[PDB]
Amino acid sequence: LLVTPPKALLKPLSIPNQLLLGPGPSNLPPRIMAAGGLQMIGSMSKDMYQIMDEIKEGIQYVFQTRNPLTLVISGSGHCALEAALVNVLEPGDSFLVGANGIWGQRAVDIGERIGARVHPMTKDPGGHYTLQEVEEGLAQHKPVLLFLTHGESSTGVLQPLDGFGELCHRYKCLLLVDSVASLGGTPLYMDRQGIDILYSGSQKALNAPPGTSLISFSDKAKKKMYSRKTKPFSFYLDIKWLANFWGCDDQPRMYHHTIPVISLYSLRESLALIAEQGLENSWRQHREAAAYLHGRLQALGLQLFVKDPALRLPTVTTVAVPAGYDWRDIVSYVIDHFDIEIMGGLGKVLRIGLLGCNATRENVDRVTEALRAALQHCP
Amino acid sequence: LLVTPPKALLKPLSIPNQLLLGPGPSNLPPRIMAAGGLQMIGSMSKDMYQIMDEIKEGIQYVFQTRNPLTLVISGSGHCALEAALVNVLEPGDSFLVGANGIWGQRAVDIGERIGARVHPMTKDPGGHYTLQEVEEGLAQHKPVLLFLTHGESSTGVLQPLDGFGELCHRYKCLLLVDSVASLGGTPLYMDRQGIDILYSGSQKALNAPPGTSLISFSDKAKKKMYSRKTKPFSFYLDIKWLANFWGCDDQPRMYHHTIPVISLYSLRESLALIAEQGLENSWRQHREAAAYLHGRLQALGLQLFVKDPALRLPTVTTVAVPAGYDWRDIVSYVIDHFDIEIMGGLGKVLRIGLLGCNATRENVDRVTEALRAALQHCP
Ligand SMILES: *Cc1c(COP(=O)(O)O)cnc(C)c1O
Numbered sequence: 001l002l003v004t005p006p007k008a009l010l011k012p013l014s015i016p017n018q019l020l021l022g023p024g025p026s027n028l029p030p031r032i033m034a035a036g037g038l039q040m041i042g043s044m045s046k047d048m049y050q051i052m053d054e055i056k057e058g059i060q061y062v063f064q065t066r067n068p069l070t071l072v073i074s075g076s077g078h079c080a081l082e083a084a085l086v087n088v089l090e091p092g093d094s095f096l097v098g099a100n101g102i103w104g105q106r107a108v109d110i111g112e113r114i115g116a117r118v119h120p121m122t123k124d125p126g127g128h129y130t131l132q133e134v135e136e137g138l139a140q141h142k143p144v145l146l147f148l149t150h151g152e153s154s155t156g157v158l159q160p161l162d163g164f165g166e167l168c169h170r171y172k173c174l175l176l177v178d179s180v181a182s183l184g185g186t187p188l189y190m191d192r193q194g195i196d197i198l199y200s201g202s203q204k205a206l207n208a209p210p211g212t213s214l215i216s217f218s219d220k221a222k223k224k225m226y227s228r229k230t231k232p233f234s235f236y237l238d239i240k241w242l243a244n245f246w247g248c249d250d251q252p253r254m255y256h257h258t259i260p261v262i263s264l265y266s267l268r269e270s271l272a273l274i275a276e277q278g279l280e281n282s283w284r285q286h287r288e289a290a291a292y293l294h295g296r297l298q299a300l301g302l303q304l305f306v307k308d309p310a311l312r313l314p315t316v317t318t319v320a321v322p323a324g325y326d327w328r329d330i331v332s333y334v335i336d337h338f339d340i341e342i343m344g345g346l347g348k349v350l351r352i353g354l355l356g357c358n359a360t361r362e363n364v365d366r367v368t369e370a371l372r373a374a375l376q377h378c379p
Numbered sequence: 380l381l382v383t384p385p386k387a388l389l390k391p392l393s394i395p396n397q398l399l400l401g402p403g404p405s406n407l408p409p410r411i412m413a414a415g416g417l418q419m420i421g422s423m424s425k426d427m428y429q430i431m432d433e434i435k436e437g438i439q440y441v442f443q444t445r446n447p448l449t450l451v452i453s454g455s456g457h458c459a460l461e462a463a464l465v466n467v468l469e470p471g472d473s474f475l476v477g478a479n480g481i482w483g484q485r486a487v488d489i490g491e492r493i494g495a496r497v498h499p500m501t502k503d504p505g506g507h508y509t510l511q512e513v514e515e516g517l518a519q520h521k522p523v524l525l526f527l528t529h530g531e532s533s534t535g536v537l538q539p540l541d542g543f544g545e546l547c548h549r550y551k552c553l554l555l556v557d558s559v560a561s562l563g564g565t566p567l568y569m570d571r572q573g574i575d576i577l578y579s580g581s582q583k584a585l586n587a588p589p590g591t592s593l594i595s596f597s598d599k600a601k602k603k604m605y606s607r608k609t610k611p612f613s614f615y616l617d618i619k620w621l622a623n624f625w626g627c628d629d630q631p632r633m634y635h636h637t638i639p640v641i642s643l644y645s646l647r648e649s650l651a652l653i654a655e656q657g658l659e660n661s662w663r664q665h666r667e668a669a670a671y672l673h674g675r676l677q678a679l680g681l682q683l684f685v686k687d688p689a690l691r692l693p694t695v696t697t698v699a700v701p702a703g704y705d706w707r708d709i710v711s712y713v714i715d716h717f718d719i720e721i722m723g724g725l726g727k728v729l730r731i732g733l734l735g736c737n738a739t740r741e742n743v744d745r746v747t748e749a750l751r752a753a754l755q756h757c758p
Pocket residue numbers: 023024076077078079103151152153178179180181201203204210635636637
């Protein structure tokens with residue numbers, strides 16, 4: 001045989017103890033770890049369906065919707081995003097994109113690839129979107145879909161949502177919102193803010209492991225996706241298939257692909273936890289924690305990138321890179337000395353993440369103490 | 380708030396004990412269960428890279444290749460398939476498809492959607508592909524890629540591979556092979572059989588949980604994918620991105636998407652297990668087990684769908700539905716009474732699956748004893 005058994009693979013697997021306080025993913029609580037270590041069931045069993053059904057109710061609770069087209073995408077953030085775009089947008093269609101960070105910049109790339117006419121409202125890092133600025137683009141381009149990034153995790157910006165859906169609906173437009181870095185860590189009401197496509201990820205404020213995502217579609221969205229001329233470019237992400245399997249339509253569930261059963265156990269639990277906490281409690285915790293963290297960082301003499309506190313994303317705090325330092329040096333120091341992960345921002349600045357169980361005063365202390373030492377030790 | 384916490388989610392998660400002896404997925408051995416219950420690490424950490432690197436060596440060992448473009452697709456079977464097609468095929472291109480079951484029939488649907496000229500060599504259930512029949516299609520259509528299903532899990536057929544790659548290479552064609560239901564359970568030598576794209580799944584004979592897949596690309600494939608006019612329809616599955624992240628190219632690893640870390644721990648172990656066993660041992664086990672199972676089924680008076688033993692897939696046995704029975708009745712009886720999953724075949728027949736740790740004489744006994752009772756109790 002050409003290749004021999006890899007020597008490295010013949011040693012036992014060993015992983016460190018890291019406190020993950022970057023934009024994502026987050027650490028796992030015991031219940032989610034426990035779920036991950038369970039045994040398989042049939043991927044098309046009555047029991048597996050029950051679990052999926054339970055998950056659906058959970059996606060409904062956290063999204064605050066009753067949309068019966070709500071389900072899990074067998075993929076990460078980008079897959080839920082891609083899934084949205086490839087099932088809603090037909091080649092030609094006009095797509096209006098809020099390019100504040102990256103997330104917009106990705107939604108763009110996807111749009112371009114599937115042959116959409118892409119309308120990029122570029123705003124420098126830190127910037128958000130004013131309803132008027134939307135209507136001016138909506139007037140200028142007459143799109144079929146707008147994409148807005150709720151929790152902009154590259155810039156630490158919390159986009160205001162209220163009233164945007166009803167603007168979009170007037171111009172016939174569909175609202176797609178990226179709530180991956182916002183869900184569970186700030187107010188969000190899918191049906192009451194009139195959102196047509198909402199998606200989130202498992203590995204941010206729900207404290208499940210990466211590789212699943214939550215998606216929900218309004219009837220307005222459902223119509224546009226169920227009255228395409230053409231078939232979507234992706235079969236894996238074809239909604240008409242997914243919807244059927246996940247039990248959304250009248251037809252009995254027909255095998256499409258194999259769902260990541262063990263991740264679904266985990267996700268189910270992560271949903272049960274925030275269902276036991278309660279959304280408003282979760283939003284309180286994140287709101288307060290964030291508040292504490294800004295105060296502490298302020299004390300160290302660091303400047304918060306997002307100036308207006310009402311525009312700061314609780315879950316992800318952007319901190320301006322202190323003049324005269326190498327960001328790599330600080331971030332590497334932190335992990336190296338204290339065993340704490342703090343990302344940078346992509347497209348610069350320092351990024352810190354309070355997500356679910358990880359969003360406690362203790363963790364803020366810890367990252368503050370760490371950034372302290374580093375500030376006085378980095379060249 | 381519109382939606383209240385789902386009452387069902389406020390009870391604790393409870394899953395049955397099922398022996399999964401269908402085409403997939405398979406049951407998990409303790410080491411893989413253990414890996415699934417571990418804590419997160421940074422998705423772009425030195426430690427996470429080591430793990431990915433280790434996995435790569437493992438994909439190289441089981442595929443029997445040295446292709447430095449080998450990596451894990453963050454998706455199931457279909458995603459690795461889709462990933463192959465969307466990165467190799469450009470709209471127009473000619474694609475020659477071995478539509479024996481299904482897997483071909485899906486590769487078709489994908490091909491059509493991404494705007495390939497699709498050439499379907501339909502063969503009734505049970506049928507395989509003769510080198511001549513290939514060359515006649517290769518002559519008739521002059522494709523850029525042929526798709527062959529190695530272990531045809533819908534029909535229980537083992538396709539012969541030997542020499543097909545060198546045929547394909549002569550006509551300038553690329554060989555893509557679906558080894559999801561064959562890898563680890565029959566001989567397969569990527570480089571020595573001249574295969575340009577080989578993919579497999581985690582949830583079949585490797586005994587990892589669903590939701591990851593293994594893919595490898597030859598230099599011939601790499602050239603075609605790295606000299607497209609256009610960008611692939613998918614960003615999630617863009618090889619130039621994936622390749623970079625997974626450390627395949629000269630550029631430092633740049634964030635694309637978030638890899639399903641916990642599934643990667645599992646997959647790493649599943650690879651370590653077959654690296655400790657050794658491929659030829661694994662092929663012996665499956666070969667023998669299969670042999671035993673056919674004998675026993677024969678004794679019950681059941682007829683094996685695939686007549687020629689040299690064409691029977693060890694890992695998945697097709698058994699002709701006995702005249703005068705409802706297949707649903709037998710299959711439901713089996714799970715209902717004995718707690719054993721035995722699928723049907725899609726596009727009919729009964730399907731039984733011996734995959735990795737699950738491929739033992741004991742499990743054959745068990746499914747035989749079960750099918751016995753059912754045969755004499757179903758109407
Ligand atoms: C993390 C994140 C993503 C990316 O999701 P993946 O897990 O990388 O697929 C996208 N958008 C936002 C807002 C995020 O926070």
